[PDB]
From a paper:
In this article we describe the crystal structure of TarS, an enzyme responsible for the glycosylation of wall teichoic acid polymers of the S. aureus cell wall, a process that has been shown to be specifically responsible for methicillin resistance in MRSA. TarS possesses a catalytic domain with a canonical GTA fold (one of two distinct A/B folds characteristic of nucleotide-sugar dependent glycosyltransferases) consisting of two closely associated α/β/α sandwich Rossmann motifs that abut and form a continuous central β-sheet. TarS possesses a D(91)XDD motif with aspartates coordinating a metal cation, a feature that is typical of the GTA superfamily. Altogether, TarS features a novel architecture with closely-associated trimerization domains connected by a linker region to three protruding catalytic domains that face away from each other.
Numbering used by the authors: 1 to 349
The structure:
Amino acid sequence: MKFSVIVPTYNSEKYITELLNSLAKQDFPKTEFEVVVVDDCSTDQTLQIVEKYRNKLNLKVSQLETNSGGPGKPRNVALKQAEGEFVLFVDSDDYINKETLKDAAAFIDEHHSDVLLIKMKGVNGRGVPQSMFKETAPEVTLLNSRIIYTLSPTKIYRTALLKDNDIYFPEELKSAEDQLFTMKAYLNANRISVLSDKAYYYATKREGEHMSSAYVSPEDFYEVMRLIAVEILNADLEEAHKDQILAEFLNRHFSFSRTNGFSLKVKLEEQPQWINALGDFIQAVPERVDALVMSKLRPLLHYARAKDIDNYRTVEESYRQGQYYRFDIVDGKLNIQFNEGEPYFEGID
Ligand SMILES: CC(=O)N[C@H]1[C@@H](OP(=O)(O)OP(=O)(O)OC[C@H]2O[C@@H](n3ccc(=O)[nH]c3=O)[C@H](O)[C@@H]2O)O[C@H](CO)[C@@H](O)[C@@H]1O
Ligand SMILES: [Mn+2]
């Protein structure tokens, strides 16, 4: 067994066939890959739709007692059932290219990848990461490539890599359940590879609610962030490398996560809740890492670590308004003091 395609379902009857047709049309022998379907207690006709593909595909189907509250637990149940050499997570509302398992198998046989990224394509207006999919690369690291800018589970992982290092998704969590999982796989992979010859994984936009839009409390969200920083800092790598990996994670988190602009969008009466959870995550980042981060984020790291929402919000409002209490211009960049009696933050551009 080469691959295990792990499919978590939850009331997926309107789009599960578009998936199952792409596996049935794979030009890969159905005897060397399995479809591990774990249903998160669906109440529509998802399972009988799946049943019609029991002679078109090698299937392993099971259903949970109650809905787990997220994609994590179903994938965890499928992953310990998987006996394929490699694992591919495909969501119920997505589908893969006809040639995916053939090109992957051929690529991994040639380069012995532990994690293999496959190029993605957005369908029906859904955005998709692309900065790391412009060239097929046999070997990429966390620091010479943009792989940290895609933490979704929609990749090829070697089964032994996940099991030998005890890598699973957090359970009862609507979103952010993928970031810690994929980063742990990145942290332990002896070789990470990118495969961009075609458009392999098709991420769709349908209706209704996608899990990436479901509510996750700031406590649960930033606990995952805190766990990622802890995983980075205690990886079996050189200490300077771990600091730089953490800095690159923070650059991306503060630029593109819900943290970016929270004190401008969240209701005032809820922002202490955010600054306390965000601060528990930044308090796990040692202050030495602030120097490796993008300069504009250093005042935010500083006031997050101190749980100071007033100065944090003033920094965000100042960036948005382009107005500062005091600033100097040195070497085409700004050195800013955001409030009276506060420190100056230098090199901001
Ligand atoms: C970035 C990307 O390309 N895909 C991610 C995106 O998918 P997305 O935002 O589309 O969320 P989805 O609804 O597709 O959920 C992902 C998968 O989990 C299953 N599911 C959903 C709810 C539930 O209670 N039990 C269950 O098993 C879905 O059927 C689906 O197969 O946001 C999710 C939340 O982090 C991630 O898991 C997906 O990997
Ligand atoms: Mn989806």
